[PDB]
Amino acid sequence: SMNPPPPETSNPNKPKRQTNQLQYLLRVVLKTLWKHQFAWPFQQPVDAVKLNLPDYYKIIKTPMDMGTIKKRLENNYYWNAQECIQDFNTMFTNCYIYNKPGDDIVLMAEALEKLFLQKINELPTEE
Ligand SMILES: CN1Cc2cc(S(=O)(=O)Nc3ccccc3)ccc2NC1=O
């Protein structure tokens, strides 16, 4: 009954960068999703322990969540936007894999993903 360590949000050996696309991701894409009524289950790592999902981390080996993404953005963890996009996709995909296609949690992930795809559609060209 332990959770894994969470995904890293800082790394002294990983080069860091600011891009206009990373700024958009924090200021428009994450901001839009974070304040959405369906954000809250996704605002922190899945706590398999407190939520009583004991097989969660047997099935999901690449956990991701918006809490993690927010810190990564804030900490300038990423070098490029594509890394951050891949984190959002990982988070959605994990939800779709672990849960049944009927579940409330899946319908929420889907609505957030739709809005995410709407916001990254207008991702500005880099400077
Ligand atoms: C991202 N999550 C997190 C998660 C949280 C929970 S919950 O027990 O809070 N129940 C709950 C909460 C909100 C909406 C619907 C159900 C259950 C399952 C999951 N599965 C996931 O995949």
Domain spanning 19-123: which CATH class is it, in words? mainly alpha
CB 69 within 8 A of CB 15: no
Helices (H), the chain: 20-24, 31-35, 48-51, 56-59, 66-74, 81-98, 104-120
Cα 26 to chain centroid distance, Å, stands at 12
Pocket of ligand 1 (CB under 6 A): 41-42, 46, 51, 53, 95, 98-99, 104-105
Say which DSSP state 17 is in. -
Length of the chain as a residue count = 127
Nearest partner of 94 among 70, 52, 58, 50, judged by Cα: 58
3 state DSSP class of 30: helix
20 CA → ligand 1 middle, Å: 33
CB 45 within 8 A of CB 63: yes
Residue-range domain boundaries for the chain? 19-123
Nearest partner of 36 among 97, 124, 119, 121, judged by Cα: 119
Q: How far apart are CA 96 and CA 91, in angstroms?
A: 9
To test the pocket of ligand 1, the residue of 105, 106, 110, 112 to mutate (highest count of ligand atoms within 8 Å of its CB) is: 105
3 state DSSP class of 72: helix
